[PDB]
């Protein structure tokens, strides 16, 4: 039977059993159940990482140490291995013989407790084809009689889904609910376990670092429970010092190391930003201004919001920024957002809201509920943010979508979290939400029926109020109205488009020269305040690209050669010099 | 154990595993996790083709080279085969005996790090109708203790849909997020792998060709990740050069071959238009005018837009051309489009908008959302 079970008491005496700090009330209840006349089989139901195994194994540590009640003294705790019992039970009845023989040892001792971790497994065991006899059925008579005591550990999902189904077995096991410890309780646990981790890595952990790990992990990590979650940062932190060369520096683990570990585990920007990041961040606005002209107010909001988050003054639970870029057509509402991610080197989560025009389309974002065809697919929005927590969420043409879809973003803007169909909670704390809208374009295009025109810009603001409920608008950091492109900015736009044309020509070996007079002519011919920058490409396409494309395929431009574009004042028509060479 | 698992370290010496280029940051956190006191089982979650198996298999290859840390040195990685473990396990206990034997071997070694690719499968390993005894349940006591180290590789969909549901197993495994590398990083990977591909195909890829494959595949090829995308154009290009020019097969693989391969994979016109295609473009306007008389402006807009796209001056992220043909009935608004497809030999995707007269019909074009009929 020694092969099947491990003596925890003996194990703790020589190497260690990960001692338990605290949990006095939990242990007291378990000891009380063990002392019961009948059904003295305590069960430990709790979430993953709460410390169920530590409590059962910790009991052995306390017994050897002697800090336990007299009734529980001189008690042996054995950890059963389900695999060992079933490893060689090929023949009929072999499993029953081993299981029954092992149980007899416990009855004879009368002071022995069995620890079956992952007790849900015993429910199904030793059933070759149709056999209903199993460890649960074989052990059931003994549990009711109270001859033997068996500690159990199971998760809430495993308990309810499988263990609870067995009503008879559940009756014998007195459920003990383990609840996640507090922040103060966790630091005490780490302090007790600190010598073991320090000896393993030959490192040391400052008191500030221990407190920082618990607090920082709670804020940025929300997929694991506090005891393991804090211990995960402390363990990996020590490895970093060990991994780094001993020659340069290996003294201790400070708060700075803890922040780096949490940042990588959570895939969030590391605190105490490096000089390289700061240089990029300070010049982010200038770079954006080069790409987009006349939208400095929009750029200022995005760059300032990102700066606050890295500086440590960001919202505790809300996203980095909720910006509604409402403006006329072709004013750079999405160019800045598309170029912001490129400058920051983060993934761009671009979602077109025209697809989400129906109320039933909400399932695409959060996934289908359980028991449906699309439950496996999940939510496109939750999956995207989970994979790329630090990213830019661009909801283009949000106004086109159904009003119901806007309600989903309320929790995202306020709590920075969206629950998927499965129940996983996404994090939007580091996501730069940008909802571009074109509401009011028709109102501005409309002309007032009066002797004097009206300021239709204010009319679009009221339309925004009708489309979006006040709660949605209140959550938004600020609504940035993009002004119509002026004549001066249009000249810069033409240069930007010409530069893009040069890149295409550079691949083919062609170099394009455009006189200043020619650039102004193109701008004047295609300058439309309502349409914006987009018609500039049309004039450039028809005037510059169209002649160049005939020659490239059927002329001198086939082989890369420089070309000069000049304006003829006599005819007011652009003159193209192919210069075959 | 030898039958079920394969020693990746041995394969590296004989060249079985390909060289690992870069991925230092991904590997740096992998050794830190493996050095942890408890739950030292790094997991590699990433999209298909990112290089998850390359990093796990590459670690064994890096150990042979000797550029890994001292801790990693003297360690041997074993690739577990789920099929072999569950082969001929009809009798009760064969799976447990084989799995327990493997765990005992790893614990005894104290330096061997297992590598279970597609780790989602162990959650659904051998079990009875109501049996809950699986490899995940059996391995859990050892993973938490830290006696054995197990590397894992599974996709994002599999991790969330299957691995995440088993919270106990997920807790033991420390997820390491792998993302597709940059363009500059991908070319380095191809250069490192270029000798193996060149030897098999007996071709030599030029520096321009390698760079072209990475840049051209990112733009034209979609739904596939960058490492796989570029490698597919390199491997496929080598095969074409080997078999097509039967007489004096071209040793070099110029940029032109790379463009042709990308066109076939993406089913789009190839760059560097050929002479035959050129004649069609100049005569397109004349051909269309003969079939559809009058309406010269319409033909000029369609033909000029196509010329610019083939010439390489087309919009980077917009269609070739968006045109609204508004006119009286019977003026050939649809004939100019039907004939254009025939002239260019491309499929005519004719979608009648009369059917989509209501908002509910939008679901037909883009599909019904998850959890609804259709």
């Amino acid at each position: 039977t020694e092969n099947f079970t491990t003596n925890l008491n003996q194990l703790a005496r020589v190497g260690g059993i990960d001692p338990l700090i605290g949990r006095e009330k939990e242990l007291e209840r378990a000891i009380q159940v063990l002392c019961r006349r009948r059904k003295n089989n305590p069960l430990l139901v709790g979430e993953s990482g709460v410390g169920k195994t530590a409590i059962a194994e910790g009991l052995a540590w306390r017994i050897v140490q002697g800090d336990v009640p007299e009734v529980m003294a001189d008690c042996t705790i054995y950890s059963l291995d389900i695999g060992s019992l079933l490893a060689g039970t090929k023949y009929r009845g072999d499993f029953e013989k081993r299981f029954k023989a092992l149980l007899k040892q416990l009855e004879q001792d009368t002071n022995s407790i069995l620890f079956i971790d992952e007790i849900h497994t015993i429910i199904g065991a030793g059933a070759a084809s149709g056999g209903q006899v199993d460890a649960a059925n074989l052990i059931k008579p003994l549990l009711s009689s109270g001859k033997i005591r068996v500690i159990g550990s199971t998760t809430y999902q495993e308990f309810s889904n499988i263990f609870e189904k067995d009503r008879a077995l559940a009756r014998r096991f007195q459920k003990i609910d383990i609840t996640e410890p507090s922040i103060e309780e966790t630091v005490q646990i780490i302090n007790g376990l600190k010598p073991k981790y320090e000896a393993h890595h030959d490192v040391r952990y400052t008191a500030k670092a221990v407190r920082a790990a618990v607090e920082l992990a709670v804020k940025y990590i929300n997929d694991r429970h506090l005891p393991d979650k804090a211990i995960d940062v402390i363990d990996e932190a020590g490895a970093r010092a060990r991994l780094m060369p001993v020659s340069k520096r290996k003294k201790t683990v400070n708060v700075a190391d803890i922040e780096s570990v949490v940042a990588r585990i959570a895939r969030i920007p590391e605190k105490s930003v490096s000089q390289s990041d700061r240089d990029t961040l300070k010049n982010l606005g200038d770079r954006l201004k080069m790409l987009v002209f006349g939208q400095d107010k929009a750029i200022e909001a995005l760059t300032e919001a990102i700066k606050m988050a890295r500086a440590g003054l960001g919202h505790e639970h809300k996203p980095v920024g909720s910006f509604l870029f409402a403006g006329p057509t072709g004013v750079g509402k999405t160019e800045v957002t598309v170029q912001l991610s490129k400058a920051l080197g983060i993934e761009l989560l671009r979602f077109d809201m025209s697809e989400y025009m129906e109320r039933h389309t909400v399932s695409r974002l959060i996934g289908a509920p359980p028991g449906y065809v699309g439950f496996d697919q999940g939510g496109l929005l939750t999956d995207a943010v989970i994979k790329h927590p630090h990213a830019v969420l661009l909801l283009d043409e949000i106004e086109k979508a159904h009003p119901d879809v806007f309600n989903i973003l309320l929790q995202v803007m306020d709590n920075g979290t969206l629950t998927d169909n499965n129940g996983r909670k996404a994090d939007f704390r580091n996501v730069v939400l940008v909802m571009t809208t074109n509401a009011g374009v028709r109102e501005t295009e409309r002309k007032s029926i009066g002797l004097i025109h009206q300021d239709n810009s204010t009319d679009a603001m009221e339309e925004i109020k009708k489309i979006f409920t006040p709660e949605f608008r209140n959550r938004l950091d600020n609504i940035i109205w993009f002004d119509h492109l002026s004549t001066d900015v249009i000249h810069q736009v033409v240069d930007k488009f010409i530069v893009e044309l040069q890149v295409q020509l550079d691949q083919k070996g062609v170099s394009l020269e455009v006189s200043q007079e020619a650039r102004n002519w193109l701008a004047e011919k295609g300058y439309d305040r309502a349409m914006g920058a987009r018609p500039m490409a049309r004039v450039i396409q028809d005037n510059l690209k169209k002649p160049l494309a005939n020659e490239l395929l059927f002329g001198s431009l086939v082989d890369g050669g420089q070309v000069t574009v000049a304006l003829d004042k006599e005819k007011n028509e652009l003159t193209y010099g192919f210069q075959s060479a | 154990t030898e039958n079920f698992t394969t020693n990746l370290n041995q394969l590296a010496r004989v060249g079985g595993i390909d060289p690992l280029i870069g991925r230092e940051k991904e590997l740096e956190r992998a050794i830190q996790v493996l050095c942890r006191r408890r739950k030292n089982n790094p997991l590699l979650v990433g999209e298909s083709g990112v290089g998850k198996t390359a990093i796990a298999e590459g670690l064994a290859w890096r150990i042979v080279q000797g550029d890994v840390p001292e801790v990693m040195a003297d360690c041997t990685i074993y690739s577990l085969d789920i099929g072999s473990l569950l082969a001929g396990t009809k009798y009760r206990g064969d799976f447990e005996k084989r799995f327990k034997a493997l765990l005992k071997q790893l614990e005894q070694d104290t330096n061997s790090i297992l590598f279970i690719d597609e780790i989602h499968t162990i959650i659904g390993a051998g079990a009875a109708s109501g049996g809950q005894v699986d490899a995940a349940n059996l391995i859990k006591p050892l993973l938490s203790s830290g006696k054995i180290r197990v590397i894992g590789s599974t996709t994002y969909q599999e991790f969330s849909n299957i691995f995440e549901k088993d919270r106990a197993l997920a807790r033991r495994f420390q997820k390491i997020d792998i993302t597709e590398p940059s363009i500059e990083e991908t070319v380095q990977i191809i250069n490192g792998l270029k000798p193996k591909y060149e030897a098999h195909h007996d071709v030599r890829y030029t520096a321009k060709a390698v760079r072209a494959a990475v840049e051209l595949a990112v733009k034209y090829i979609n739904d596939r990740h960058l490492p796989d995308k570029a490698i597919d154009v390199i491997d496929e290009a080598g095969a074409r050069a080997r078999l097509m020019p039967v007489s004096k097969r071209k040793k070099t693989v110029n940029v032109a071959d790379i463009e042709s391969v990308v066109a076939r994979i993406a089913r789009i016109p190839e760059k560097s238009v050929s002479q035959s295609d050129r004649d069609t473009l100049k005569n397109l306007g004349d051909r269309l005018k003969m079939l559809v008389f009058g309406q010269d402006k319409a033909i000029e807009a369609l033909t000029e837009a196509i010329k610019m796209a083939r010439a390489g001056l087309g919009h980077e992220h917009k269609p070739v051309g968006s045109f609204l043909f508004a006119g009286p009935t019977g003026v050939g608004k649809t004939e100019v489009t039907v004939q254009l497809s025939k002239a260019l030999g491309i499929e005519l995707l004719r979608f009648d908008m009369s059917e989509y007269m209501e908002r509910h019909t939008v679901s037909r074009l883009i599909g019904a959302p998850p959890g609804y009929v259709g």
Partner: peptide, 25 residues
Amino acid sequence: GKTNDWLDFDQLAEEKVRDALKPPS
């Protein structure tokens, strides 16, 4: 518009069978 009808996805239970041996003598 029109009403939206949802469709469920039936899931059937599947199981395997183990074997127990018995030496003749």
